[PDB]
Specification:
Order of helices and strands of chain A: EEEEHEEEEHH
Helix content of chain B: 10-25%
CATH class of chain B: Alpha Beta
CATH superfamily of chain B: Ribonuclease Inhibitor
Oligomer: heterodimer
Chain A: LIM and senescent cell antigen-like-containing domain protein 1
Largest interface: A-B, 19 and 37 residues
Bound molecules: zinc ion
Entry title: Crystal structure of Rsu1/PINCH1_LIM45C complex
PDB class: protein binding
Structural class of chain A: alpha+beta
Strand order of the largest sheet of chain A: 1-2
CATH architecture of chain B: Alpha-Beta Horseshoe
Strand order of the largest sheet of chain B: 1-2-3-4-5-6-7-8-9
Keywords: Leucine Rich Repeat, protein binding
Radius of gyration of chain A: 23 Å
Number of strands of chain B: 9
Number of strands of chain A: 8
Shape of chain A: rod-shaped
CATH topology of chain B: Leucine-rich repeat, LRR (right-handed beta-alpha superhelix)
Assembly: dimeric
Number of helices of chain B: 4
C-alpha cells in the first residue's frame, strides 16, 4: 500500500521523504551525530547513513598523506596519519603496503622491513634506544 | 635494466621501480631519459654518486626517490620539475644544495634525512618552497635553523632530530599547520616562548624532544607532560627566565 519509514518502521500517511533508496518520515530522517532532522536540507551519504553539512566534514575529512587529497574510499590509519588504500606504501622504496605488512616507524614514517634492514648499523643501534 | 624501459612506454606504466639494481650511473640505464611520460621514479638503494641534468627531461615526475645512494651534488635542473611533489634525498652524502633549488613550485614533501647538511648548505631561495607540508632534516649537522623557516606556512611536519642545534628560531611559532615537531638529540637548552602559540598535544600530533640538555624546570615540565610544557612556556615567569637566559 503506502510507503513505510525505515527508521522507526511504521507506516506513513502524510509527507514522504525519499533518500538512499528508503522512504523516511520527515521528523525521523536525522543525522547520525546530532539527532537533528534535515527537513529538506541536503544530506551526505556515507557507507549507509546520512549526515548534515558540518558533521560529514568533521568525521570523513581524513586526508591522504601521499596524494594530499580527501580520502573517498577506505582509510588506512597508522602513525598519527592516514593513507588511501592504493596510496599507502613504503616511504623509502614506494612499494605498496598494508597494515598486515611488517613495517617500522621512522620519524613517524612507514619503512618496509627490507629497507630498514638496509639501514646503517649505527642508526639502527641509536633507534633501538629511542 | 633494458627490460623495464621498453615495457614502460608501450603499456604506459607511469611508475618505474629500479630499486636495488646496482646502478652507478643513470646514463647507463638504457633509454631511461626517453620516458617523459613517467610520473614516479624509484632509484633507491643503488650506487649513484651524482644526478645528471638529463633528469630535467623527465618533466612529468611527481615522485622522485634517491634514498640511500652516494650522491654528492645535484644539478640546478633538479628544480625544473614542475610536477614534482615528493623528493626523497634521504641517506646520501649531500653537504650542499644547487643554486635556485627552492624554485620547485609544487614540492610538498622534502626528505633530507641522514646527510651532511647545515644551514650553510641551503641556497638563498630555499624557503621559497612555501608549498612544503613535510620537511625532514633528521640526522644532519645544523647548528642554527634560519628564521625563514617561518615562511613555510603550510608545513605540518618538521623533523630536526639528531642535529647540532643550540637554539630554535621563534619563527617556528608562525607554523600554524604543524602537527609533528621532531627535535630530539640536539643541544637545545631552552625553548622560545612563541612555540607556546602552537599546540601539539593532540592524539594525532607529535612532539618528541628527548636527549636535550634542557634547563631543570623545562625538564620537570617534560616529566609532567607535553601539555604542562606548552602551558609553562606561555607563563610570565618563564618569559622573564628566558629573558635572563638570553642576557
Ligand atoms: Zn518514522
Ligand atoms: Zn549532524
Ligand atoms: Zn591517496
Ligand atoms: Zn621499503
Amino acid at each position: 500500500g503506502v510507503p513505510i519509514c525505515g527508521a522507526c518502521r511504521r507506516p506513513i500517511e502524510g509527507r514522504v521523504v525519499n533518500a538512499m533508496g528508503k522512504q523516511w518520515h520527515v521528523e525521523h530522517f536525522v543525522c547520525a551525530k546530532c539527532e537533528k532532522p534535515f527537513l529538506g536540507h541536503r544530506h551526505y551519504e556515507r557507507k549507509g547513513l546520512a549526515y548534515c553539512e558540518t558533521h560529514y566534514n568533521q568525521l570523513f575529512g581524513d586526508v591522504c598523506f601521499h596524494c594530499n587529497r580527501v580520502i573517498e574510499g577506505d582509510v588506512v590509519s597508522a602513525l598519527n596519519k592516514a593513507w588511501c588504500v592504493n596510496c599507502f606504501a613504503c616511504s623509502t622504496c614506494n612499494t605498496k603496503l598494508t597494515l598486515k605488512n611488517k613495517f617500522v616507524e621512522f620519524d613517524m614514517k612507514p619503512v618496509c622491513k627490507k629497507c630498514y634492514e638496509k639501514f646503517p648499523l649505527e642508526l639502527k643501534k641509536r633507534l633501538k634506544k629511542l | 635494466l633494458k627490460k623495464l624501459v621498453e615495457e614502460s612506454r608501450e603499456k604506459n606504466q607511469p611508475e618505474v621501480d629500479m630499486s636495488d639494481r646496482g646502478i652507478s650511473n643513470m646514463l647507463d640505464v638504457n633509454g631511461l631519459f626517453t620516458l617523459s611520460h613517467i610520473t614516479q621514479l624509484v632509484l633507491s638503494h643503488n650506487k649513484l654518486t651524482m644526478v645528471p641534468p638529463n633528469i630535467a627531461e623527465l618533466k612529468n615526475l611527481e615522485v622522485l626517490n634517491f634514498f640511500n645512494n652516494q650522491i654528492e651534488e645535484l644539478p640546478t635542473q633538479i628544480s625544473s620539475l614542475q610536477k614534482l611533489k615528493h623528493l626523497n634525498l634521504g641517506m646520501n652524502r649531500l653537504n650542499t644544495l644547487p643554486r635556485g633549488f627552492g624554485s620547485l613550485p609544487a614540492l610538498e614533501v622534502l626528505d633530507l634525512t641522514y646527510n651532511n647538511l647545515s644551514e650553510n648548505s641551503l641556497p638563498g631561495n630555499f624557503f621559497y618552497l612555501t608549498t612544503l607540508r613535510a620537511l625532514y632534516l633528521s640526522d644532519n649537522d645544523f647548528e642554527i635553523l634560519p628564521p625563514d623557516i617561518g615562511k613555510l606556512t603550510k608545513l605540518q611536519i618538521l623533523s630536526l632530530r639528531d642535529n647540532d642545534l643550540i637554539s630554535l628560531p621563534k619563527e617556528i611559532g608562525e607554523l600554524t599547520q604543524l602537527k609533528e615537531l621532531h627535535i630530539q638529540g640536539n643541544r637545545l637548552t631552552v625553548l622560545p616562548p612563541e612555540l607556546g602559540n602552537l599546540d601539539l598535544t593532540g592524539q594525532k600530533q607529535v612532539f618528541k624532544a628527548e636527549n636535550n640538555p634542557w634547563v631543570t624546570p623545562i625538564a620537570d615540565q617534560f616529566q609532567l607532560g607535553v601539555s604542562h610544557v606548552f602551558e609553562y612556556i606561555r607563563s610570565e615567569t618563564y618569559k622573564y627566565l628566558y629573558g635572563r637566559h638570553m642576557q
